[PDB]
PDB file of N, CA, C and O and ligand atoms in Angstrom:
ATOM      1  N   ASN B   1      97.730 100.484 101.691  1.00 55.96           N
ATOM      2  CA  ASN B   1      97.560  99.857 103.031  1.00 55.96           C
ATOM      3  C   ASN B   1      97.331  98.315 102.951  1.00 55.96           C
ATOM      4  O   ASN B   1      96.222  97.835 102.693  1.00 55.96           O
ATOM      5  N   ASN B   2      98.400  97.558 103.228  1.00 59.75           N
ATOM      6  CA  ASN B   2      98.325  96.072 103.378  1.00 59.75           C
ATOM      7  C   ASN B   2      98.247  95.705 104.886  1.00 59.75           C
ATOM      8  O   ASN B   2      98.728  96.444 105.753  1.00 59.75           O
ATOM      9  N   UNK B   3      97.654  94.546 105.196  1.00 63.16           N
ATOM     10  CA  UNK B   3      97.558  94.030 106.594  1.00 63.16           C
ATOM     11  C   UNK B   3      96.116  93.486 106.812  1.00 63.16           C
ATOM     12  O   UNK B   3      95.729  92.432 106.302  1.00 63.16           O
ATOM     13  N   UNK B   4      95.320  94.251 107.569  1.00 62.16           N
ATOM     14  CA  UNK B   4      93.958  93.860 108.021  1.00 62.16           C
ATOM     15  C   UNK B   4      93.955  92.779 109.153  1.00 62.16           C
ATOM     16  O   UNK B   4      93.249  91.772 109.070  1.00 62.16           O
ATOM     17  N   UNK B   5      94.721  93.046 110.219  1.00 64.11           N
ATOM     18  CA  UNK B   5      94.952  92.113 111.351  1.00 64.11           C
ATOM     19  C   UNK B   5      96.495  92.035 111.578  1.00 64.11           C
ATOM     20  O   UNK B   5      97.226  93.016 111.385  1.00 64.11           O
ATOM     21  N   UNK B   6      96.978  90.871 112.032  1.00 63.94           N
ATOM     22  CA  UNK B   6      98.383  90.695 112.507  1.00 63.94           C
ATOM     23  C   UNK B   6      99.269  89.805 111.576  1.00 63.94           C
ATOM     24  O   UNK B   6      98.775  88.925 110.863  1.00 63.94           O
ATOM     25  N   UNK B   7     100.606  89.980 111.653  1.00 63.02           N
ATOM     26  CA  UNK B   7     101.582  88.995 111.098  1.00 63.02           C
ATOM     27  C   UNK B   7     103.056  89.510 111.127  1.00 63.02           C
ATOM     28  O   UNK B   7     103.527  90.098 112.105  1.00 63.02           O
ATOM     29  N   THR B   8     103.781  89.256 110.024  1.00 61.40           N
ATOM     30  CA  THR B   8     105.189  89.700 109.793  1.00 61.40           C
ATOM     31  C   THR B   8     105.486  91.223 109.997  1.00 61.40           C
ATOM     32  O   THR B   8     106.370  91.588 110.778  1.00 61.40           O
ATOM     33  N   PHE B   9     104.742  92.092 109.299  1.00 58.55           N
ATOM     34  CA  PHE B   9     104.901  93.572 109.387  1.00 58.55           C
ATOM     35  C   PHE B   9     104.411  94.236 110.718  1.00 58.55           C
ATOM     36  O   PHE B   9     104.979  95.244 111.142  1.00 58.55           O
ATOM     37  N   UNK B  10     103.389  93.665 111.376  1.00 56.94           N
ATOM     38  CA  UNK B  10     102.941  94.081 112.726  1.00 56.94           C
ATOM     39  C   UNK B  10     101.405  93.885 112.794  1.00 56.94           C
ATOM     40  O   UNK B  10     100.924  92.768 112.582  1.00 56.94           O
ATOM     41  N   UNK B  11     100.644  94.930 113.151  1.00 57.24           N
ATOM     42  CA  UNK B  11      99.187  94.798 113.448  1.00 57.24           C
ATOM     43  C   UNK B  11      98.428  96.067 112.960  1.00 57.24           C
ATOM     44  O   UNK B  11      98.684  97.181 113.424  1.00 57.24           O
ATOM     45  N   UNK B  12      97.481  95.877 112.027  1.00 56.59           N
ATOM     46  CA  UNK B  12      96.590  96.967 111.526  1.00 56.59           C
ATOM     47  C   UNK B  12      96.742  97.073 109.979  1.00 56.59           C
ATOM     48  O   UNK B  12      96.531  96.098 109.254  1.00 56.59           O
ATOM     49  N   UNK B  13      97.092  98.265 109.474  1.00 59.25           N
ATOM     50  CA  UNK B  13      97.247  98.519 108.010  1.00 59.25           C
ATOM     51  C   UNK B  13      98.229  99.710 107.790  1.00 59.25           C
ATOM     52  O   UNK B  13      98.047 100.772 108.397  1.00 59.25           O
ATOM     53  N   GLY B  14      99.295  99.530 106.983  1.00 59.60           N
ATOM     54  CA  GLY B  14     100.456 100.464 107.046  1.00 59.60           C
ATOM     55  C   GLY B  14     101.413 100.605 105.855  1.00 59.60           C
ATOM     56  O   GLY B  14     102.629 100.554 106.023  1.00 59.60           O
ATOM     57  N   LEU B  15     100.854 100.910 104.683  1.00 57.88           N
ATOM     58  CA  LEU B  15     101.591 101.518 103.532  1.00 57.88           C
ATOM     59  C   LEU B  15     102.795 100.681 102.982  1.00 57.88           C
ATOM     60  O   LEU B  15     103.964 100.923 103.294  1.00 57.88           O
ATOM     61  N   UNK B  16     102.472  99.664 102.173  1.00 58.17           N
ATOM     62  CA  UNK B  16     103.421  98.583 101.798  1.00 58.17           C
ATOM     63  C   UNK B  16     103.537  97.380 102.800  1.00 58.17           C
ATOM     64  O   UNK B  16     104.247  96.410 102.523  1.00 58.17           O
ATOM     65  N   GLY B  17     102.818  97.411 103.937  1.00 55.27           N
ATOM     66  CA  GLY B  17     102.599  96.229 104.822  1.00 55.27           C
ATOM     67  C   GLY B  17     101.509  95.274 104.207  1.00 55.27           C
ATOM     68  O   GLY B  17     101.340  94.119 104.604  1.00 55.27           O
TER      69      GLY B  17
HETATM   70  C1  LIG T   1      97.613  93.795 119.913  1.00 55.73           C
HETATM   71  O1  LIG T   1      96.304  94.244 120.380  1.00 55.73           O
HETATM   72  C2  LIG T   1      96.217  94.894 121.692  1.00 55.73           C
HETATM   73  C3  LIG T   1      96.676  96.366 121.581  1.00 55.73           C
HETATM   74  O2  LIG T   1      96.458  97.080 122.796  1.00 55.73           O
HETATM   75  C4  LIG T   1      96.922  94.036 122.792  1.00 55.73           C
HETATM   76  O3  LIG T   1      96.074  92.938 123.128  1.00 55.73           O
HETATM   77  C5  LIG T   1      98.297  93.482 122.342  1.00 55.73           C
HETATM   78  O4  LIG T   1      99.251  94.539 122.327  1.00 55.73           O
HETATM   79  C6  LIG T   1      98.254  92.830 120.940  1.00 55.73           C
HETATM   80  O5  LIG T   1      99.622  92.518 120.544  1.00 55.73           O
HETATM   81  C7  LIG T   1      99.867  91.201 119.989  1.00 55.73           C
HETATM   82  O6  LIG T   1     100.917  91.301 118.982  1.00 55.73           O
HETATM   83  C8  LIG T   1     102.308  91.453 119.385  1.00 55.73           C
HETATM   84  C9  LIG T   1     103.145  91.378 118.095  1.00 55.73           C
HETATM   85  O7  LIG T   1     102.669  92.341 117.160  1.00 55.73           O
HETATM   86  C10 LIG T   1     102.689  90.352 120.410  1.00 55.73           C
HETATM   87  O8  LIG T   1     103.987  90.575 120.946  1.00 55.73           O
HETATM   88  C11 LIG T   1     101.687  90.328 121.585  1.00 55.73           C
HETATM   89  O9  LIG T   1     102.016  89.242 122.447  1.00 55.73           O
HETATM   90  C12 LIG T   1     100.220  90.188 121.115  1.00 55.73           C
HETATM   91  O10 LIG T   1      99.996  88.857 120.661  1.00 55.73           O
HETATM   92  C1  FA7 T   2      98.842 100.327 100.963  1.00 56.31           C
HETATM   93  O1  FA7 T   2      99.785  99.635 101.352  1.00 56.31           O
HETATM   94  C2  FA7 T   2      98.876 101.044  99.625  1.00 56.31           C
HETATM   95  C3  FA7 T   2      99.909 101.620  98.982  1.00 56.31           C
HETATM   96  C4  FA7 T   2     101.172 101.721  99.423  1.00 56.31           C
HETATM   97  C5  FA7 T   2     102.183 102.273  98.739  1.00 56.31           C
HETATM   98  C6  FA7 T   2     103.589 102.359  99.296  1.00 56.31           C
HETATM   99  C7  FA7 T   2     103.854 103.729  99.946  1.00 56.31           C
HETATM  100  C8  FA7 T   2     103.780 104.837  98.881  1.00 56.31           C
HETATM  101  C9  FA7 T   2     105.215 103.778 100.655  1.00 56.31           C
END
């Protein structure tokens, strides 16, 4: 789970994001 907020992939945390 990559992310932790917003950007290129979208918003939240989501398995290779
Ligand atoms: C994400 O958080 C909330 C979910 O209900 C809402 O305030 C908005 O949907 C918010 O979305 C933001 O991100 C998208 C791109 O991922 C933009 O299009 C929106 O304008 C907003 O900045
Ligand atoms: C979070 O992003 C951690 C691992 C992700 C692996 C990729 C997934 C198996 C498609």
